[PDB]
Design a protein around this ligand. Structure first.
Ligand code: ZN
Lengths: 257, 4
């Protein structure tokens, strides 16, 4: 029964998920002056040419675009990572207004939204096993600002009317997630957690420096989704972001000078 | 994460 309301939002999560107060929680504020350039970091390898999207789901907290992860079809490697991470799903976090919505912040700047491309380490065989390991997941985070439309997002925007309420899904085949990337793959990286319950400390975060631009109309359509199920009272799906958590004993490293 |  966790969510993003006054009564069940992030400040309540610790009562059912005590790791909420742990040593490697996400998101964090990225202090760009304190992040150290690490010349040992490799370019990110994003290999999405053979990606197979299957379905889009409103899970009551966001919408997930799901992929076939039964083979190495859409993988992340290089950057800070050892080995091969398979894309399982992407989703977004967004605000009620354009001045909030991202989970990570940059020098305390909040973006309108944040895209999470979620990948699991093939050495653990399945996502459920991977989330039990400190190097189980790699999440590629991309900021969204409001300006020009993102053409590669529109297929997502246009299906949202069909999954308005919690538990609705729709076929979502042949979607190319390459259309959601910015030009540069310059990134920050740090060790962290899932940003929703169960808040497991299993993520290598890779946050791109360059945002993507989406239109006001695209993000307005995100904000028409519902947290509620069909024939429950309407609660708009907005402000589904966790605030920045303490950095504690962590270093954020930059891939770029 | 949970099953799912
Ligand atoms: Zn997320």
């Amino acid at each position: 029964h966790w969510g993003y309301g006054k009564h069940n939002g992030p400040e309540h999560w610790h009562k059912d998920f005590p790791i909420a107060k742990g040593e490697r929680q996400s998101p964090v504020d990225i202090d760009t002056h304190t992040a150290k350039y690490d010349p040992s970091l490799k370019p990110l390898s994003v290999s999405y040419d053979q990606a197979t999207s299957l379905r889009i789901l409103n899970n009551g907290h966001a919408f997930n675009v799901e992929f076939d992860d039964s083979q190495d079809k859409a993988v992340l490697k290089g950057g800070p990572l050892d080995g091969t991470y398979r894309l399982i799903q992407f989703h977004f976090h967004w605000g009620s207004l354009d001045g909030q919505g991202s989970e990570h912040t940059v020098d305390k700047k909040k973006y309108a939204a944040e895209l999470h491309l979620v990948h699991w380490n093939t050495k653990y065989g399945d996502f459920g096993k991977a989330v039990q390991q400190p190097d189980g997941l790699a999440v590629l985070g991309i900021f969204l600002k409001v300006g020009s439309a993102k053409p590669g997002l529109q297929k997502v925007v246009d299906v949202l009317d069909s999954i308005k309420t919690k538990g609705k899904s729709a076929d979502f085949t042949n979607f190319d997630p390459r259309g959601l990337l910015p030009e540069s793959l310059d990134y920050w990286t740090y060790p962290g957690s899932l940003t929703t319950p169960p808040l497991l400390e299993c993520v290598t975060w890779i946050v791109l420096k360059e945002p993507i631009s989406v239109s006001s109309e695209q993000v307005l359509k995100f904000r028409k989704l519902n947290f509620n199920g069909e024939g429950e009272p309407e609660e708009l799906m907005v402000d589904n972001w966790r605030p920045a958590q303490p950095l504690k004993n962590r270093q954020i490293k930059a891939s770029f000078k | 994460x949970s099953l799912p």
